[PDB]
Enzyme design. Structure first.
Site, mmCIF file in Angstrom:
data_model
loop_
_atom_site.group_PDB
_atom_site.id
_atom_site.type_symbol
_atom_site.label_atom_id
_atom_site.label_comp_id
_atom_site.label_asym_id
_atom_site.label_seq_id
_atom_site.Cartn_x
_atom_site.Cartn_y
_atom_site.Cartn_z
ATOM 1 N N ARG A 1 0.868 -1.182 0.000
ATOM 2 C CA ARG A 1 0.000 0.000 0.000
ATOM 3 C C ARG A 1 0.894 1.217 0.000
ATOM 4 O O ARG A 1 1.864 1.267 0.770
ATOM 5 C CB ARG A 1 -0.895 -0.014 1.249
ATOM 6 C CG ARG A 1 -1.809 1.226 1.438
ATOM 7 C CD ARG A 1 -2.609 1.113 2.759
ATOM 8 N NE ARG A 1 -1.757 1.268 3.946
ATOM 9 C CZ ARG A 1 -1.949 0.647 5.114
ATOM 10 N NH1 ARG A 1 -2.965 -0.184 5.268
ATOM 11 N NH2 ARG A 1 -1.133 0.859 6.137
ATOM 12 N N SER B 1 3.129 -5.371 7.398
ATOM 13 C CA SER B 1 1.937 -6.035 7.925
ATOM 14 C C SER B 1 1.875 -7.491 7.489
ATOM 15 O O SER B 1 0.856 -7.945 6.959
ATOM 16 C CB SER B 1 0.676 -5.283 7.512
ATOM 17 O OG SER B 1 0.587 -5.256 6.108
ATOM 18 N N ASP C 1 11.765 -2.443 15.510
ATOM 19 C CA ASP C 1 10.450 -3.055 15.613
ATOM 20 C C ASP C 1 9.742 -2.851 16.951
ATOM 21 O O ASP C 1 8.509 -2.690 16.941
ATOM 22 C CB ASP C 1 10.439 -4.530 15.143
ATOM 23 C CG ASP C 1 11.434 -5.413 15.877
ATOM 24 O OD1 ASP C 1 11.510 -6.627 15.540
ATOM 25 O OD2 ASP C 1 12.122 -4.934 16.780
HETATM 26 O O1 LIG Z 1 12.986 -8.572 16.620
HETATM 27 C C1 LIG Z 1 13.069 -8.475 18.028
HETATM 28 C C2 LIG Z 1 14.511 -8.065 18.361
HETATM 29 O O2 LIG Z 1 15.399 -9.101 17.925
HETATM 30 C C3 LIG Z 1 16.765 -8.840 18.258
HETATM 31 O O3 LIG Z 1 16.891 -8.856 19.678
HETATM 32 C C4 LIG Z 1 17.312 -7.540 17.662
HETATM 33 O O4 LIG Z 1 18.638 -7.294 18.129
HETATM 34 C C5 LIG Z 1 16.405 -6.356 18.056
HETATM 35 O O5 LIG Z 1 16.837 -5.144 17.416
HETATM 36 C C6 LIG Z 1 14.938 -6.699 17.750
HETATM 37 O O6 LIG Z 1 14.105 -5.662 18.267
#
Ligand SMILES: OC[C@H]1O[C@H](O)[C@H](O)[C@@H](O)[C@@H]1O
Ligand SMILES: CS(=O)(=O)c1ccc([C@@H](CC2CCCC2)C(=O)Nc2nccs2)cc1
Length: 434
Positions: free
Chosen positions: A77, A141, A170
């Site tokens: 999107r 998504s 994230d």
């Molecule tokens: O994906 C969840 C996490 O995985 C790992 O710990 C990465 O180092 C981190 O940056 C991320 O937020």
């Protein structure tokens, strides 16, 4: 017989963690967080406490128009966002979903991003926004890095310019998307392949940045907790084996206790121990079971979803070359529960550490807080969430915690993630056209 049942449980009980053990982990987490925040201990700190530059107040006024590009399973999107400050931000969105035609060439990432760039071009034309050279952020998504691929594909086209901005972590996307729905959201956590959390810290405590007023999100990178020896007394034989065969032995030890990257492999090694002790599969493992990575984390979730007839358990074990008895199937279910319950408890101590620290840093009494959560283990595993919530709450007596998972809605939560990503890039001087 009965002696065999007792012996299995004696082996599986090594996974248990008492309230007092979790309080220990929790306090040690608080101590490591303090270390990562201070200028004098930041370099030796296991838990890095990265400033994210995402502030509790609006920043980057100059950015009032931007694009957000959402990558789904099969479609994507393009969304044009306009922020009005004529309030609590006035947002108009206009968007278009694109599916990949079957005749399109998408065999390589470069080919796919050529197609994406062409749709962006069309979209920018339809809305007369080509000369504005807008910033663009990504969101995901899902049911080589995309920033680089898109930057390269747009350059190949040469007909328009954009600032493609860096993504936020994230955990931070999770906090911001949840904040959209509940302004009391000040913690983001991911329990997926990996495990990490972010939270809103007092500026005066973030020694790596200038300013003593307000709050800024901090990305703990807590998966590296234990990397200074903090967890050694809790490590089991299975953890040591997982560590030894990993890409990074000695590192990310906390993450290795919790994350979906390792959870299935832990269960595999438990099953092999019960086999070696003649307590499972008549003491004979298959070639598949003796293969690293063969017990997938998704099998752990599936085993624990079994209704009681053991049919789902049998079918997994069958595909792995085994012919399990009814007792075998039940032992496998207990091994899964043991590993996953430990992951939930270890995770709960970390989040309790963060929450109790925030309450201390602020306290005027009972702290009421919203925690945003995503990730495959948290969402798909049938009982992880319940066990995790119960344990966090036991460890956070003077807090009222609401857990939330963001929903897609009209895509306005994702728009806020991209607004923050673009305004952060603005504030950091990373926009070549804004
Ligand atoms: O994906 C969840 C996490 O995985 C790992 O710990 C990465 O180092 C981190 O940056 C991320 O937020
Ligand atoms: C109430 S409001 O005006 O709509 C409003 C809109 C955005 C923010 C924040 C983001 C929120 C999401 C989670 C944390 C707070 C912001 O723009 N921070 C930034 N930091 C750097 C660049 S932008 C605050 C208030």
């Amino acid at each position: 017989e009965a002696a065999k049942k007792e012996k299995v449980e004696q082996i599986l009980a090594e996974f248990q963690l008492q309230e007092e053990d979790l309080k220990k982990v929790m306090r040690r987490m608080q101590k490591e967080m303090d270390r990562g925040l201070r200028l004098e201990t930041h370099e030796e700190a296991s838990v890095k406490m990265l400033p994210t530059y995402v502030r509790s107040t609006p920043e980057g006024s100059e950015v009032g128009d931007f694009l957000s590009l959402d990558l789904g399973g099969t479609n994507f999107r393009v969304m044009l966002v306009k922020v009005g400050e004529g309030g609590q931000w006035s947002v108009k969105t206009k968007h278009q979903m694109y599916s990949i035609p079957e005749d399109a060439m998408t065999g390589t990432a470069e080919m796919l991003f050529d197609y994406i760039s062409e749709c962006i071009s069309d979209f920018l034309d339809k809305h007369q926004m080509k000369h504005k050279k807008l910033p663009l952020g990504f969101t995901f998504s899902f049911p080589n890095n995309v920033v680089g691929l898109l930057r390269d594909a747009i350059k190949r086209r040469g007909d328009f310019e954009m600032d493609v901005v860096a993504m936020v972590n994230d955990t931070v996307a999770t906090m911001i998307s949840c904040y959209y729905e509940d302004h009391q959201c000040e913690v983001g956590m991911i329990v997926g392949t990996g495990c990490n959390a972010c939270y809103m810290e007092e500026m005066q405590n973030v020694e790596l940045v200038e300013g003593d007023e307000g709050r800024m999100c901090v990305n703990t990178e807590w998966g590296a907790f234990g990397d200074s020896g903090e967890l050694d007394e809790f490590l089991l034989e299975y953890d040591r084996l997982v560590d030894e065969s990993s890409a990074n032995p000695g590192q990310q030890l906390y993450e290795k206790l919790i994350g979906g990257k390792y959870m299935g492999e832990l269960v595999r090694l438990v099953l092999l121990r019960l086999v070696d002790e003649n307590l499972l599969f008549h003491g004979e493992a298959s070639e598949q079971l003796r293969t690293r990575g063969a017990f997938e984390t998704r099998f752990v979730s599936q085993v624990e979803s079994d209704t009681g007839d053991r049919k789902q358990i049998y079918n997994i074990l069958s595909t792995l070359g085994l012919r399990p008895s009814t007792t075998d199937c039940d032992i496998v279910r207990r091994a899964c529960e043991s590993v996953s319950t430990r992951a939930a408890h270890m995770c709960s101590a970390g989040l309790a550490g963060v929450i109790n620290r925030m309450r201390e840093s602020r306290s005027e009494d009972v702290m009421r807080i919203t925690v945003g959560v995503d990730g495959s283990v948290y969402k798909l595993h049938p009982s992880f969430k319940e066990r995790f919530h119960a344990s966090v709450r036991r460890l956070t007596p003077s807090c009222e915690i609401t857990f939330i998972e963001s929903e897609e809605g009209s895509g306005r939560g994702a728009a806020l993630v991209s607004a923050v990503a673009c305004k952060k890039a603005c504030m950091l001087g990373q926009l070549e056209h804004h």
